[PDB]
Each structure stands twice: as C-alpha cells, then as structure tokens.
Design an enzyme around this catalytic site. Sequence first.
Site, mmCIF file in Angstrom:
data_model
loop_
_atom_site.group_PDB
_atom_site.id
_atom_site.type_symbol
_atom_site.label_atom_id
_atom_site.label_comp_id
_atom_site.label_asym_id
_atom_site.label_seq_id
_atom_site.Cartn_x
_atom_site.Cartn_y
_atom_site.Cartn_z
ATOM 1 C CG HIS A 42 -1.947 10.798 18.374
ATOM 2 N ND1 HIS A 42 -1.812 10.575 17.016
ATOM 3 C CD2 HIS A 42 -0.702 10.689 18.898
ATOM 4 C CE1 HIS A 42 -0.534 10.382 16.727
ATOM 5 N NE2 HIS A 42 0.163 10.463 17.848
ATOM 6 C CD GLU A 43 -1.857 9.500 25.243
ATOM 7 O OE1 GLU A 43 -2.291 8.734 26.137
ATOM 8 O OE2 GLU A 43 -1.006 10.415 25.464
ATOM 9 C CG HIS B 237 0.665 5.893 19.671
ATOM 10 N ND1 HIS B 237 1.513 5.678 18.605
ATOM 11 C CD2 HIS B 237 0.454 7.231 19.729
ATOM 12 C CE1 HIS B 237 1.801 6.838 18.040
ATOM 13 N NE2 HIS B 237 1.178 7.798 18.711
#
Lengths: 101, 103
Positions: free
Chosen positions: B86-87, B90
Amino acid sequence: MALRSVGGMVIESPRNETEHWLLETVGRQAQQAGIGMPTVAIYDSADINAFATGAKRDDSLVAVSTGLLHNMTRDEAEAVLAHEVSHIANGDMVTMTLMQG
Amino acid sequence: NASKGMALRSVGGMVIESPRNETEHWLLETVGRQAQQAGIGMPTVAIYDSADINAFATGAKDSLVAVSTGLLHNMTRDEAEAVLAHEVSHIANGDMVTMTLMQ
Ligand SMILES: [Cl-]
Ligand code: NA
Ligand code: NA
C-alpha cells in the site's frame, strides 16, 4: 471513545453527494471484507488522514478528515479506505496520513 | 569474535544494503518486488527502533521506506507485506505516507 475524542461527527444517513459516496464506498468494502457496516464519520483536520478501528474495545468505525475529502480524488480515497477496512476486519486500529507531492 | 558472520540484530536508523538477518532479506525482496510491479526504482529501505507499529515512505524525489521494529515484531509477513504494498502505491504516485497501527 475513538470518535468523541477527536470531535468526529457521525453520518447517520447520506444528505449530499460526498456523504452518499463515503457510505456506499465503506459499505461495499465492509461487505467485501465480510464484516458489519462500520460507523462512518468525518472530523476536522487540514491533514489528509483516515483512521479506522475494528478493535474489540471500540464500536467499528471509519473516520475521514475534511482535509482528505478536500484533497483526494474518489479513486485515491477509495484505495486508502479499502486498505483501512482490511485492518478493521483484522480487529486492529489504523491511522494513515498522506502528503501529496 | 564469536559473532562474526552470524545473523545480527538490525541497526535502527541504518540503511539496509547487505541483509544482517533473514527479516532484512525478506524486506528487501518484498519491497523490490512491489517496486518492480509498481514500475518504480528500488526504494532505500531502513528499519528504525520503536515500540510503535509504523511504516513510512516518501517518493517525493530516490525513495525511502522505513519500518519500525514494533511493526516487524507484531505483524506477520502477509500483514507487513500488505502495508508495504500500500505504501509503495503512494510512492509510485510521488506522494508521502505514514501509517501507524494500534493492535
Ligand atoms: Cl526483526
Ligand atoms: Na475542517
Ligand atoms: Na513510540
């Protein structure tokens, strides 16, 4: 306590497009994750933040900041919420803060 | 002299180049795979000492992913992999992210 301590404001039923989108998004994600509908709230912060909990201690909750709703597209925000719902389903509390480059 | 060549504790705040232990190897491999899939260069990776469960990342410039010992102690590999993925998403957007769990 997770809501009250941040001055979070619960959406009981949707009354504008943003509330409708937030409820339907969290509702779909909760359904897909096999969990009950969390309480959904908005709270005031300039930060782009969402926090959520499915811990035994708390009522299940997803809270988004006004800064998140102001700065994220629906597609971007839906990705963050989907990830946080996965943590609720695990019985954890999560908070995530973003800054856009 | 006994410890030379053995697996060693991660050094909080040190960028991971040659893995000191099996968790470091797993972390580089996982982040490398996620970076490749997201179509970005390999981030710098570091572990830092903290009881809190947190990972943070920046792709504003190349990128960096930093994970707390608390996270590594408390999350399974699958759970940690999902947070990292998920990071990485980003970073791939050129954004910065920090995420903390209270279990
Ligand atoms: Cl470790
Ligand atoms: Na506000
Ligand atoms: Na701490």
